[PDB]
Each structure stands twice: as structure tokens, then as C-alpha cells.
Amino acid sequence: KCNTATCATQRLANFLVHSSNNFGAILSSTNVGSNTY
């Protein structure tokens, strides 16, 4: 199981990309962090 919420979003995005080859849109995954203290 995932210990963090970031693990879960990564698994979800990976599954969406790796299951949508025959889907009607190109899915492109990128990450956004705060870059703050």
C-alpha cells in the first residue's frame, strides 16, 4: 500500500498513461511542487 498521498497520485497518473494507448487523447504527465520552505 501507499504510505503517502504522493505515492497514490504517482500510481494513478502512471496507470492512466499506461492504459490509454487506444484512448481518444494523448495523456502527458508532469509534476508540480512548491519549491518553497
Partner: protein, 135 residues
């Protein structure tokens, strides 16, 4: 400062988001399919206003270089699904008004990482995307 944070974000977008979206454009031209931008969001922002500004930049960047049709934001939330769904609705309202494209914001908790719950959220996301492309 928040400005220096956004300066580091802009450096990150040119090094990471741009290469991935350049690939997406080529795949989109081979197959004749529009591009949907999928954003994972770290839960490390000091305020929702900085989160909104950062996401607006990332989405506007993607519009600029890849004419994306929609954006799916996966908002990592360290808490309950009820709180996560409320926070997603707030963020979605901001991004829709600010970016001018269809935005789907989904709150994701650690428990959603179960492979069986991944399938649920995936099903829900693809169905919403199918409405934007064909309904």
C-alpha cells in the same frame, strides 16, 4: 519569497514539462489526437493562493507550447476523501476561471493508491474526459 518559488517552478517547467509535452505533440500528430495534460501536485504549498498561481503557470505553459485541450490535476491530499474532494472543487473553480480550458481536479488520498481504487478513479477520469472530447 513566493516570487523566488515561482522562479524555481519556471526553471522546472522548461526542464521537465516542456520535454514531455514536446513528445506529446509528436504522438498527437502521428495519431491525430488532442492532448490532455495530467498534473500531479505535491502537498507542500504554504497557501492555496500559491498553489493556484503555480498551477495556472503550469497550465498556461502547456497551452503555450502544446495547445492542450484539457488538464487533469491530481491533488495529493494527506487526509480524508471528504476533505480532498472539497479542496479539489475549490482548486477546480480557480483554474477553470483562470486558464480558459476544461480542468478536472481530483483529490487523491494515500488510501486511493490501492490498485482497486486506482481503477475506480481512472474509470471516473476517462469518462469525464470522454465527455469533453465527444459529449
Amino acid at each position: 519569497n513566493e516570487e523566488e518559488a515561482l522562479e524555481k517552478l519556471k526553471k522546472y517547467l522548461k526542464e521537465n514539462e516542456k520535454p514531455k509535452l514536446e513528445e506529446a505533440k509528436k504522438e498527437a500528430e502521428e495519431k491525430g489526437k488532442p492532448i490532455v495534460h495530467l498534473i500531479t501536485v505535491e502537498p507542500d504549498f504554504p497557501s492555496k493562493e500559491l498553489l493556484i498561481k503555480a498551477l495556472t503557470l503550469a497550465i498556461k505553459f502547456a497551452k503555450e507550447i502544446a495547445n492542450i485541450k484539457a488538464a487533469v490535476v491530481l491533488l495529493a491530499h494527506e487526509g480524508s476523501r471528504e476533505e480532498a474532494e472539497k479542496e479539489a472543487k475549490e482548486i477546480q473553480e480557480a483554474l477553470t476561471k483562470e486558464t480558459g480550458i476544461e480542468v478536472i481536479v481530483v483529490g487523491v488520498t494515500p488510501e486511493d493508491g490501492d490498485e482497486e481504487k486506482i481503477q475506480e478513479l481512472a474509470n471516473e477520469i476517462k469518462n469525464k474526459l470522454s465527455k469533453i472530447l465527444h459529449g
